[PDB]
Design a protein that fits this description.
This is part of a larger assembly, with chains A, B, C and D. By secondary structure, chain A is of the alpha+beta class. Chain A is about 20% helix and about 25% strand. The chains are: A alpha+beta, B mainly alpha, C mainly alpha, D alpha+beta. Bound molecules: magnesium ion (12 copies). Chain B binds one RNA strand through helix 2, helix 7 and helix 8. Chain B: Belongs to the universal ribosomal protein uS4 family.
RNA sequence: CGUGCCUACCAUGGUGACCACGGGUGACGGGGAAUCAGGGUUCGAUUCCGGAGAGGGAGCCUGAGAAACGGCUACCACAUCCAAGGAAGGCAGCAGGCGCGCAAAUUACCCACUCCCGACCCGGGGAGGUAGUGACGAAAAAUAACAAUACAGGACUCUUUCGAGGCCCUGUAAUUGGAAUGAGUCCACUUUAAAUCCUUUAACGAGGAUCCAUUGGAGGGCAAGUCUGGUGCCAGCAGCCGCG
């Protein structure tokens, strides 16, 4: 079914170069919509300042009220629904604080419990959330 | 701009599967048998043995009368004899591939100390080779990861030291306590 | 939602326990010595049908 | 106590000098300083001690040999001429007396701004 | 200097489905780097070669070599001192400052080494070298160890041994040493243009108040608890299945 002659390498590179676009990973890696569509400008982390604190509902088999921080960016200016990771930290994240955000496990999908949140809170005003969830490095007053 | 040095070798192999029960048991009994600190210095010996195996298979790929094969094979046999893994008997290139991991660990410093005395419990021989008490030759040896070459293999002395060399490094504390 | 301020409930209602004085932990070469001597010298009387590494 | 020997030896009769590599053996105390090795090498060469220079000293990690480079000369005028001023500074034959930063560059600037009699007035004083 | 590089005339030509022409590149081109059957895939701004540029872009003197910018002239956008008539500027150099961003070093010393410029053995060089921050990353590696006495939890040689232990792992907050050596406290060396750091040596320098090893996990993948007490689809955990 293939083409296997000694002068067919142009036909091969043309056919594979056409069929290589049908993979999701190649087109999301080499098409500009993964720069001009997502936030971060194609980055891993970005600062942001809190707009509001919204509780979202979880999925159907898991009944939980997840806590989320609507983040106004500094670089791009988009509105990002983040996620407060740990048990407390809602009392530690106040209104209009500098918040560093990241991903969960994948840029494309989200966590199977939270419906529409791709992003996760890392820092609270240049002091990280792991210290605030532990006992050291309390916030400035 | 600057021109000093830019080179980087990683004598360090992390295996693909991180958690294998039989392999972790083998590595733990290997460390407990040959007196080591962590598994990165097991992986050093694994990487050196694997590099020797890759070079040996690259030599065995070529034809028998090839000059590069003859030169590099004779040099590799000479280097393995000067290390002390092989003998002066079988000089076959597949006899290089017929080697295990424990041969270089036997040809380390403190295992040759265990074979030729003054070791006294390898876990104490770690301290005996960290502190200046076991000295292969006039150039002082301090580092545990040291390959004992077969050319001398016996010059294990120590001079100007605590048990035989002399001096009062810390027995002056006990003598001032008794005085 | 109205119940948004249910935060830190478990860490506010969980009773604290004082961490008691634990001895120092031997590390590195000593830790590998005790890991070898925990499961490679005096375990083979207990036969390998049943396993008891933690209980 | 100590033992001073040579390893490599060269002779440059163009400059009337003899170069050598010096190993000093130590089964005992610490690294012997600049003065005593120079005095013992002057005694072994059987001339005046104010002519032999030496530089560099290593240590082979506990006793052993210490390695350096020794310059044995025969003429003190050739010693003052051929040796650089930084190796005259070990005995204090050359002194600069102003080892300060930006003095040369600020004199260049004050001679770059004004020109002539005012330049000779400000830049020299 | 050969050239449609330019000019006058004449002919209508030249390229292309073997991708011409036009667009985008978060495209400087390579030697190379990462990735371990082989074939491949992705980067390469970056120390070496070559090219381009000195906010954009045009013109030019000198000079063999420049359309140079730590050279000049004019325009646009900035921007300094004015006593308001005029002057003076280009850190994508070395430090450093502002902004930007998740993101990156000190207004240090020296021409001592390497070479480079100049009339010259003699001057100079933020080119460079040394030092400071530095867990980008790489190499070696103690972290409390070890050989001793004894209660033995007792596996093992073998004799009714309810043990003779010249083999033994281990809890020993039980004792004794090399009182080791290492980190730090620091004389004198040494290195160095002057120092610092590597190493050497003099005196100090451990017995759980030690001189303190953390980072994640313990349902399967994936190593490890059907331990205890609260929380009771709430908090939450979990990258996937799932638990509450
Ligand atoms: Mg996912
Ligand atoms: Mg570009
Ligand atoms: Mg590879
Ligand atoms: Mg390949
Ligand atoms: Mg060209
Ligand atoms: Mg240019
Ligand atoms: Mg220039
Ligand atoms: Mg400039
Ligand atoms: Mg600029
Ligand atoms: Mg956890
Ligand atoms: Mg398991
Ligand atoms: Mg996780």
């Amino acid at each position: 079914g293939k083409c296997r002659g000694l002068r067919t390498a142009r036909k091969l590179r043309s056919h594979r170069r056409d069929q290589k676009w049908h993979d999701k990973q190649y087109k999301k890696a080499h098409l500009g919509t993964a720069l001009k569509a997502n936030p971060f400008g194609g980055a891993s982390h970005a600062k942001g300042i809190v707009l509001e604190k919204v509780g979202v509902e979880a999925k159907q088999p898991n009944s939980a009220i997840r806590k989320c921080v609507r983040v106004q960016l500094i670089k791009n200016g988009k509105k990002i629904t983040a996620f407060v990771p740990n048990d407390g930290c809602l009392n530690f994240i106040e209104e209009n604080d500098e918040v560093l955000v990241a991903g969960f496990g994948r840029k494309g999908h989200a966590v199977g419990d939270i419906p529409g949140v791709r992003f996760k809170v890392v820092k609270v005003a240049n002091v990280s959330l792991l210290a605030l969830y532990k006992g050291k490095k309390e916030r400035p007053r | 701009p600057v021109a000093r040095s830019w080179v980087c070798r990683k004598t360090y192999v992390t295996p693909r599967r991180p958690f294998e029960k039989s392999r972790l048991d083998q590595e733990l009994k290997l460390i407990g048998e040959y007196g080591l600190r962590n598994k990165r210095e097991v992986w050093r010996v694994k990487f050196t043995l694997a590099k020797i195996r890759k070079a040996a298979r690259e030599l065995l790929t070529l034809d028998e009368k090839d000059p590069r094969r003859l030169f590099e094979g004779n040099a590799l046999l000479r280097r393995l004899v000067r290390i002390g893994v092989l003998d002066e008997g079988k000089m076959k290139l597949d006899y290089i591939l017929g080697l295990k991991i424990e041969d270089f660990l036997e040809r380390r410093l403190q295992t040759q100390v265990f074979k030729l005395g003054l070791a006294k419990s390898i876990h104490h021989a770690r301290v005996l080779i960290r502190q200046r008490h076991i000295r292969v030759r006039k150039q002082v040896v301090n580092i545990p990861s040291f390959i004992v070459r077969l050319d001398s293999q016996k010059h294990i002395d120590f001079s100007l030291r605590s048990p035989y060399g002399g001096g009062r490094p810390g027995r002056v504390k006990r003598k001032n306590a008794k005085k | 939602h109205g119940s948004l301020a249910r935060a830190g409930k478990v860490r506010g209602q969980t009773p604290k326990v004082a961490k008691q004085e634990k001895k120092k932990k031997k590390t590195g070469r000593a830790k590998r010595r005790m890991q070898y001597n925990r499961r490679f010298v005096n375990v083979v009387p207990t036969f390998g049908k049943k396993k008891g590494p933690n209980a | 106590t100590v033992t001073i020997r040579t390893r490599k030896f060269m002779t440059n009769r163009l400059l009337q000098r003899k170069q050598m590599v010096i190993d000093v053996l130590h089964p005992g105390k610490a690294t012997v300083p600049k003065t005593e090795i120079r005095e013992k090498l002057a005694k072994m060469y059987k001339t005046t001690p104010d002519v032999i220079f030496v530089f560099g000293f290593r240590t082979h990690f506990g006793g052993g040999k210490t390695t350096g480079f020794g310059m044995i000369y025969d003429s003190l005028d050739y010693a003052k001429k051929n040796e650089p001023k930084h190796r005259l500074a070990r005995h204090g034959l050359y002194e600069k007396k102003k080892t300060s930063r930006k003095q040369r560059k600020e004199r260049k600037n004050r001679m770059k701004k004004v020109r002539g009699t005012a330049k000779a007035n400000v830049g020299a004083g």
